[PDB]
Amino acid sequence: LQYGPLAYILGEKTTKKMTENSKLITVDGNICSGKSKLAKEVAEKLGLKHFPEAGIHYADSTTGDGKPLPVRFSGNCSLEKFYDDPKSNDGNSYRLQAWLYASRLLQYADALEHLLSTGQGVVLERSIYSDFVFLEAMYRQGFIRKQCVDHYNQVKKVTVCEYLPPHVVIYVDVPVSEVQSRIQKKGNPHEMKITSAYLQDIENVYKGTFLPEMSEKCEVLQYSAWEAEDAEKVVEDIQYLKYDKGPWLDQDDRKLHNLRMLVQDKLEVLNYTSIPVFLPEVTIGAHQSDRVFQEFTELPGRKYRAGYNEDVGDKWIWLK
Amino acid sequence: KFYIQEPPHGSPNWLKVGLTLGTSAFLWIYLIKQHNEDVLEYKRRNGLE
Amino acid sequence: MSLVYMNIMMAFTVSLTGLLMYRSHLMSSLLCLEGMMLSLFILATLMILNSHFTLASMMPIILLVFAACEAALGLSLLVMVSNTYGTDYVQNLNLLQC
Amino acid sequence: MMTGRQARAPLQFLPDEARSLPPPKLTDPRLAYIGFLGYCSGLIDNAIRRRPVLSAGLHRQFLYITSFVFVGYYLLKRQDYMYAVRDHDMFSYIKSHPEDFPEKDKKTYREVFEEFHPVR
Amino acid sequence: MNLMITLLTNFTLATLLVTIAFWLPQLNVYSEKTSPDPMGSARLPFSMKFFLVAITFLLFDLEIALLLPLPWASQTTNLNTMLTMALLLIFLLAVSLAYEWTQKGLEWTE
Amino acid sequence: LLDLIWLETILPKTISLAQMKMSTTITSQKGLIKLYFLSFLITILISTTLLNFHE
Amino acid sequence: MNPIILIIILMTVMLGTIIVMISTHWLLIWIGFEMNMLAIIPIMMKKHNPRATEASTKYFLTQSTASMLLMMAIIINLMFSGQWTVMKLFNPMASMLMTMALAMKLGMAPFHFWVPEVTQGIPLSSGLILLTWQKLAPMSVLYQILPSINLDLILTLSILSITIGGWGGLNQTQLRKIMAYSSIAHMGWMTAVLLYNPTMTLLNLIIYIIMTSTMFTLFMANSTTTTLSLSHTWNKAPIMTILVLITLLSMGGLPPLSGFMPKWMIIQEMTKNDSIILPTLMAITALLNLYFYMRLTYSTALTMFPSTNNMKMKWQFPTTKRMTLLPTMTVLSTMLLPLTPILSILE
Amino acid sequence: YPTKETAHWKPPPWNDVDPPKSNLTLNFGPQGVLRLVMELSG
Amino acid sequence: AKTLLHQYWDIPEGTECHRKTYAATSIGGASGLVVSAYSVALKTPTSFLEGVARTGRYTFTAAAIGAIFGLTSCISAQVREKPDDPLNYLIGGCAGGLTLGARTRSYGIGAAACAYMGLTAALVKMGQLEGWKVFAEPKV
Ligand SMILES: Nc1ncnc2c1ncn2[C@@H]1O[C@H](COP(=O)(O)O)[C@@H](O)[C@H]1O
Description:
This is part of a larger assembly, with 9 protein chains of 9 kinds. Chain B is mainly alpha-helical. Chain B is built from 1 helix and no strands. Helices cover 67% and strands 0% of the residues of chain B. Chain B is rod-shaped. Chain B starts with 13 loop residues before the first helix and ends with a helix. Chain G has one domain (1-347). Helices cover 0% and strands 19% of the residues of chain H. Chain H has no helices and 2 strands. In chain H, strands 1-2 form a two-stranded antiparallel ribbon. The radius of gyration of chain H is 24 Å and the shape is rod-shaped. The relative contact order of chain H is 0.22. The chains are: A alpha/beta (320), B mainly alpha (49), C mainly alpha (98), D mainly alpha (120), E mainly alpha (110), F mainly alpha (55), G mainly alpha (347), H mainly beta (42), I mainly alpha (140). At the A-B interface, loops of A face loops of B. Residues 31-33, 36, 53, 55, 79, 97, 100, 134 of chain A line the site of adenosine monophosphate. Adenosine monophosphate (AMP) is lined by residues 31-33, 36, 53, 55, 79, 97, 100, 134 of chain A. Chain E: GO terms for molecular function: NADH dehydrogenase (ubiquinone) activity. Chain E: It is an enzyme of class 7 (translocase). Chain E: Core subunit of respiratory chain NADH dehydrogenase (Complex I) which is composed of 45 different subunits. Interacts with TMEM186. Interacts with TMEM242. Chain E: Keywords: Electron transport, Membrane, Mitochondrion, Mitochondrion inner membrane, NAD, Respiratory chain, Translocase, Transmembrane, Transmembrane helix, Transport, Ubiquinone.
């Protein structure tokens, strides 16, 4: 372990690198809001690091070779099957949503660690504070049950409460007809199978639940469809902001050091994600878990720790 | 290389390895010297000379 | 021994029977703790002053100061309850049973 | 139960008279068992951190074995000194007071009566 | 017993004064006041700084009582040990004051 | 009658039933500190008078 | 949680305990006790949640009542003796008050009512500290007062503590309450033997300290607080399941493990003084302890409980926690039996 | 081992954090003359 | 309540029924009072009347257990002309178990209480005869 309390004793203070440009900015929107490139523009305007949307193989990408692991080893859920049958028997919907929330939590932990260590601000898309707007859009469409909803609420309550919200959020306002037309012109062979009621529900939860609390707990900006293209207006608006809200104001060196200690233990971040609540859409019995665990242990680069694999070509294993 | 990020345990910590080797050698020679001194004092005390 | 000694013992037993079977909030418990404080202080001072042990006059004052700081700690604990439940009642202390 | 013995020289792990005993050899079976315990501790430390058990941390395993064998040697020395004190005090108090320890006349079997209970 | 005589006389004079101030004007037949503060209906806020400075006063007074017996102690034979002890105790008071300064104690009630 | 019911009833099941019953009686506290301190008072009074542990 | 402040607080706890150990005056014993509890109060307020405040309030009230009883015993001893050496007391009331004061301090039943609650509401490091290091000082106090200890009172407290701890641990499913009741039962077990041979008491204290430290280290390493997550841990590291299985086997005194070392030898000092029914009764209650231990290992490793889906991400990250002294304390808690006469160093 | 008395004991929260379950307002009287409605935070 | 045990054991077995009966009744009453006091302290009573009802129920039940056990042991020791026999205490313990089962409105509980109380009284006689010491003074 490199960073510890000994470093903080020796003078590794995290507000030494906390300049005025170290800002946590997340951008939101609809299914095909076109924000995906816009944040990239911010990555070439304020110099901030940008992170893509947390996919299924994001945890596969961050460690090991970074290659996409097969869906049996990680996820066991596919977006194409969700677009095919949302009310399926095996419960692809809630399993996919729980896996994506876990991946987004891992992405937010990595983003917070990078911001706290390197001192450089970070731009994200659809952070963990804007994921339930998907799940509620499932429940109002009947895609899941009530037990899944309260289990997700318990998971969010035990996971979010140890973290701080981002500095500025940006929501791109794209209506339902524009979203459906953009999906039609995009050309994905499986993306038209969702009803427009799902996009309407996403927009309704966005403008009914997300904005009334992100107008209070953090800084909020709102833009229409065409105003998202004008990058200079957006960066001038975010660079001329007066931060008075949010708990980022009352952060001393001790609290940020504790946060840095907590986000550098990836087991500690995801310890409360998979609580022992037995909901038949996410629990898997002993036989399949044992089989897939023994198969994952046979994968190259994963049988031992990252510095102790002979089959991938690590030398001086006997002197460590 | 195989791992995209460099692992913290990728390279052997040579300072810690040398410290472990030196500590083992020092403790071994200290134990041997202590045993030799104690057995010499024992044979001088009880006259098994 | 002397009758004042037995009066101090009876006072300490009164503070003991008041400290255990309370009905009110934690302030009553801390007040009975201060009763124990005062009884022990008076008994130690009477013993030291009656037997002419000159050095053990260090005993009474010290016998206050340490636990006095401990008493201050108890006050902070009550403030924590006053920052959590509004009132410092002992009937609100039923969250750890389950 | 030796509260009156070590009180003359308190906080002494190994006193001077402990040097009068034969010290235990470096090939003591208990000492080798403690070295085996150190090797097992090294194996457990390699196993719990997801490392190759029989290859990784050879210097770590040697340090574990060396530290365990050192503390085992010193603890064995203290144990031998304590039991030497115990039976020396036993023999000394037996020698000093032979009125409470009479010499029993060990009678032969030619006249002592043993009751016999037949089995059938 | 003269000290207790003075205390009893003084307490009884105070009792006489409060009896004159409380029961002597009751002879008059002026009126009965039915009488049907900024505090409307809210609970009393727990301003934590007052409690903090009160317990800080308590700790400082306790070790002031520790610091007390120097005028009697100044006639002792071992003056060097006394000087070291007194200087180190006042240094402990300075260190506790410095800590109470640093950890946001003397802010918003300076 | 015997090797599946009565022999199962005499030694192990009566013991297990008594164990679980008195365990449920022991761990059925309400978490109130006042009751604990009242039980402390009763214990102290019993030890001082009804047992005479200080002779 | 300033590291300088945490280091200073831990040094204050160590200084208070060692002041209880090395002093020759009753006032310094009480000084060490007071400074120890005063500096251990912030350890149980590490996480800043109301349950910790509840637990620390109950702990402070019980420890302060015990300390006031301790001064009652000291002042009575001063009245009847006129001297302050830490040795046998000179009054039966002093011995009685001191005995239940130390029983209140150590969580001995029926004064145990704070132990399963407080340990439920504090973080696992604070629980380890309270169940491991706090028990050391009043053991020294009880060891230095053994000529004047009344036999009936300490025997009644011991048997009541063992029985109550076993029967209370028979029902709880939380790990911390099971640990608390196990600590109560072990406390009664090693206070039953004190008046006959205190070397057995010191040996059982060291063995219990090592074994409880191993258990708490494993619980902080697996980040598990209840039975269900401890069941779920078998997807993450099966070697940790094997380790918790073998040290829970050792925890119930099953040979050839280390936990069979003290209690059996405690029986070796029961029949010397012509007592036969007592080790049998405490052995039956140790069997109750082994029953809920066996329940814990059945839930943990000897079966394969159904897991969730997110374990896969937990299979992509090794344990980054500072697993300190886990292998040494695991080996010393399982394979120490052929080195039984090492207890001679505790004389 | 659930009984009637302990049938209402919920499982504890997984993070072991209790849920958390304002400001002063003053009405200064008119006793120039001014009536101030005053909001305080200490 | 230590000298009460001595007064119970001062009367020889199977000689005078009355004083053994009152000694066993007082022992049972004391035990029931301790159990009732601990039950009231730990389990909060609904009111004063229900609390003293539970206290009286426990006290009278335990006093009846003691009186029945002592009376039955004494009449069995008289009818066997053998004070030094554990059979009399076994019969008295079974009578106490039967009375406890009748009080608790049960019969299997009564039979189990017969067996266990008879074995316990037999072991009490065993300790009285052979000098078993469960609270042994430190000898070595
Ligand atoms: N409930 C959901 N249904 C479909 N896609 C989702 C859901 N939640 C998150 N996503 C992700 O969000 C992406 C859409 O964002 P984008 O197409 O980048 O604007 C999808 O391709 C998924 O990776």
